[PDB]
């Protein structure tokens, strides 16, 4: 597909929209140019969504409770507000963890204040207090409590910060109030931030004067990995086999304690830049700790990262870094040998949140796959910068794409495989185009690391070359 051709498409598509919308949308669609280094010159992002267009975006809450906090295993997260939000997100994100559920770990659990006609009327600041006591009594081993506020809290002046301070002090227990009310911001992003800040203000600096923790010149912390299907663990193992010592994981199978010792580290390894760069930049000021972003999607990008990381230490590390790559070379290569053929030349289209849309490209190319179009559901301009460099030439880029939009593009471009969310998975399948949840690994994974890729491949395969696809068209049609 030519450049002058793609441009035309976008236009032919926007012809449906009404004036006002047709304009804002035109700004969120572009034809990649690997040359440009400033996104602002072709694609605008992180702006309010147009009403009625069926976006795939979400809200602060999700970006907060479901994205950052919910993952911590030892604390208890309270979905403060009506029952709604709390229920849908329950165990909806496969951010794995190790622990005895209900006793000292609570992730696949739903804690909510369940607001009622009266809690909205007279505020439920009261209930929230009582609640905590009941909490503290029935799940003693909890090492902390959070309060992810849903849409109604901020709208009725309730004041959680107080209750927290009070009850927290009163019980010698940590309690984090989070103003993640859905109406704030326009995506899951503002939630991240709001969340990050919260993390800092009420938890981060809790062990600054405390120096009993024995450190080492090889301590690090993985920031930005949510152990989706075990991603973290697959990444973790490499870093350690590399000799390093990761003190924490944010927030994949992470614990409050692991978070607290984060300042006692030498290097911050950030995966999801968009989700936690906020706490990193901070950690750099209030702790002088350096932070670099890596990527473990596909042998190539992985190897490249492993070294670029070892390069921040001594020989002992950089030697091991090679010992590792060595060990796994036979494996990842053997994989490419089996699947690379079965995929070579197949074009793919993606649309995810704020990192994967680009991070996974490498892995795909490593399998002769061609990403003809990717885009973000809520990424910021700085994300598209890092992006345009990975995406090929004359490719298609879309921000906060609309249901209609995404659907039409696919129809013209006719990708060989679409990787996106669940609110899509089923649409394109009826059109007969293989699909893979790039969000939840389609209940598979992990995809990060070496032992990961193996699967990533195997999967892309099974789904793309599955016979079922050759049967859509009826014989008598």
């Amino acid at each position: 597909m030519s450049r002058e051709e793609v441009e035309s498409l976008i236009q032919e598509v926007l012809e449906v929209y009404p004036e006002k919308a047709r304009k804002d949308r035109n700004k969120h669609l572009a034809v990649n140019d690997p040359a440009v280094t400033q996104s602002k010159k072709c694609i605008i992002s992180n702006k309010k969504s147009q009403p009625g267009l069926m976006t795939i975006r979400g809200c602060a809450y999700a970006g907060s409770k479901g994205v950052v906090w919910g993952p911590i295993k030892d604390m208890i997260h309270i979905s403060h507000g009506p029952v709604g939000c709390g229920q849908y997100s329950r165990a909806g994100r496969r951010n794995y963890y190790i622990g005895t559920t209900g006793v000292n770990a609570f992730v696949t659990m739903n804690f909510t204040s369940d607001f009622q006609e009266k809690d909205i009327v007279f505020g439920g600041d009261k209930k929230l207090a009582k609640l905590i006591d009941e909490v503290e009594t029935l799940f003693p081993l909890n090492k902390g409590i959070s309060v992810q506020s849903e849409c109604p809290i901020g709208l009725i002046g309730d004041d959680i910060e107080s209750v927290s301070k009070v009850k927290g002090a009163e019980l010698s227990k940590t309690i984090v109030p989070v103003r993640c009310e859905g109406f704030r911001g326009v995506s899951q992003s503002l939630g991240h931030h709001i969340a990050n800040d919260a993390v800092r203000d009420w938890v981060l600096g809790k062990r600054d004067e405390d120096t009993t923790f024995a450190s080492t010149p090889y301590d690090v912390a993985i920031i930005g990995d949510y152990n989706i299907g075990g991603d973290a663990w697959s990444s973790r193992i490499l870093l350690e086999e590399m000799g390093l010592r990761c003190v924490a994981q944010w927030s994949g199978d992470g614990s409050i304690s692991e978070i607290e010792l984060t300042p006692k580290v030498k290097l911050n390894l950030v995966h999801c830049y968009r989700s936690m760069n906020y706490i990193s930049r901070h950690m750099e000021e209030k702790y002088g700790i350096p932070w670099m972003e890596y990527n473990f999607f596909g042998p190539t990008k992985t190897i490249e990262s492993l070294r670029a990381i070892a390069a921040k230490f001594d020989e002992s590390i950089q030697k091991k870094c090679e010992e590792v790559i060595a060990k796994y070379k036979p494996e990842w290569e053997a994989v490419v040998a089996k699947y690379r053929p079965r995929l070579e030349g197949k074009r793919v289209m993606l649309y995810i949140g704020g990192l994967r849309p680009r991070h996974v490209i490498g892995a795909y190319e490593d399998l002769g796959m061609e990403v003809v179009g990717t885009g973000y559901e809520f990424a910021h301009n700085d994300d598209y910068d890092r992006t345009m460099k990975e995406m090929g030439d004359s490719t298609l880029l879309y921000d906060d794409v609309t249901g209609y939009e995404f659907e039409e593009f696919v129809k013209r471009i006719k990708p060989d495989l679409i990787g996106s969310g669940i609110k899509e998975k089923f649409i394109f399948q009826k059109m007969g185009i293989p699909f893979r949840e790039m969000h939840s690994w389609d209940y598979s994974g992990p995809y990060h690391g070496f032992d990961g890729f193996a699967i990533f491949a195997r999967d892309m395969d099974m789904t793309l070359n599955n016979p079922c696809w050759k049967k859509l068209q009826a014989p008598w049609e």
């Binding site: 449906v16 929209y17 009404p18 309010k48 147009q50 009403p51 009625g52 267009l53 069926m54 976006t55 795939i56 975006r57 809200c59 602060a60 809450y61 009506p82 709604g84 939000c85 709390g86 229920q87 849908y88 329950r90 794995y96 559920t101 209900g102 006793v103 000292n104 696949t108 804690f111 909510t112 204040s113 369940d114 607001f115 009622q116 809690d119 209930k127 929230l128 009582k130 029935l138 081993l141 849409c151 901020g154 709208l155 109406f183 911001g185 193992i237 350690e240 990761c246 614990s255 494996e331 609110k423 089923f426 009826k430 007969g432 598979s444 992990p446 032992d451 193996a454 068209q473 049609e477």
Partner: protein
Amino acid sequence: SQQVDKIKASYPLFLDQDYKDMLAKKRDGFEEKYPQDKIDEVFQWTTTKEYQELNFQREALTVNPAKACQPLGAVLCALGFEKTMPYVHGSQGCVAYFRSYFNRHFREPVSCVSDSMTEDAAVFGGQQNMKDGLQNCKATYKPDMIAVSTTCMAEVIGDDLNAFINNSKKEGFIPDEFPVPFAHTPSFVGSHVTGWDNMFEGIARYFTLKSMDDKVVGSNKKINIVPGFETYLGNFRVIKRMLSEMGVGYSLLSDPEEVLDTPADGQFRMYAGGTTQEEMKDAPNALNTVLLQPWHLEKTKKFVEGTWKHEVPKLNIPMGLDWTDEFLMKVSEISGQPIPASLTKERGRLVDMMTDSHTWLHGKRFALWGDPDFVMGLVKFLLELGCEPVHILCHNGNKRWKKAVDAILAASPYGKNATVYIGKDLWHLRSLVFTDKPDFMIGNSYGKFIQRDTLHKGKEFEVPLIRIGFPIFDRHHLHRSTTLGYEGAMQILTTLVNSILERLDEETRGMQATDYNHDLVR
């Protein structure tokens, strides 16, 4: 590591020694986790009667609810109408979960939109998000009708759906005769089922309120059928089938049975079949209106009896031998069509089955939960089978209901040890199954955990979960099942007896130990 020949995924990958020794360090090293022996202590504690008492005293805390908010049902309901696009006036994040939720349960595309209201509207409402919204939607997905619901926000800051809609028409954002029914659906009131009630009602009005003059009860010789919040396709169908087999003219109000099962032929349909608008407009002319799931259609029965002037019967959700009879009968009475040999037989067979395998079901303690009608129908049926529904929980139920159920329980020897609970959640149920242990749980996937827990305490304590309800995510295509009518009875009866036998096999498969009761013929 990985053997390109036999790749291992998340599981059992992490069972590999290295991963084992990997996580072990991470634990001891930075997790500062409570000594196992404590975790084992605390756990054991929660499985006690003492913990229960403390648990049931909860007032402000709710752990693992068993209900969703109103909009979720308003959406579903709206989906039952030809080219109708569910529109939720409020924050966009909500619609996200809605589609996302249903998709996992139906494994089908759920079409629904939002006028993405934000912070900048928490002061001056969204009289604009509505204007632009309705226009954008109508011109993009070109629906024939747009039903409007609301989210938490929308109601708290209080927006007048009616007004806003009337202005979006006045100011010319959407034609003035373009159907745009509406209903307020506060999250903080009742459960999702309530949404449906409202929504439906909201549509009923929009097509029959301002025009009851030329309407005359019985003029069409049809019976209106309102399914309520139903998530099992097979139901909508069996209803239609039974009636059509009876020669009865019917008008199913709110039929999503088509858009929830669009076929995979190469093209995506965002709409499919469903209750036509004309069907709604005419409804008033129907001989009468039957409510399949009454216990959560009061706001509709009111309107129906009040406006349309229909004599809605006092019928229970048609589940199990008994009630379904009553349903067929009342239907006859109204329509004037005799119960066809066909059904007389289906019934007979349902009975055959019952006798064919009571021996196994007899005296089997169950703990169950779900929605009002569903739950009570399940209870009723278990009694018709000779089981003891010991823990009938129902988070979204009310007192009036609890009574009706107790009445049903009291009318059967098999209801002596039955207890009904409302307002309680799955964390409560968790205890009821430890202290006063049943043999199985009949409920949704959220119950998969309760099982895990019962096992952690021990094999002899594990309580197998029998998925029947909503939502269901850890199994596929069960949404094609059927619970209503005799067809339904049969399915459930089988899903049961077999679940039982299924487990008895597992308990007697032990070689030279218990495999002596591993009979071939059962």
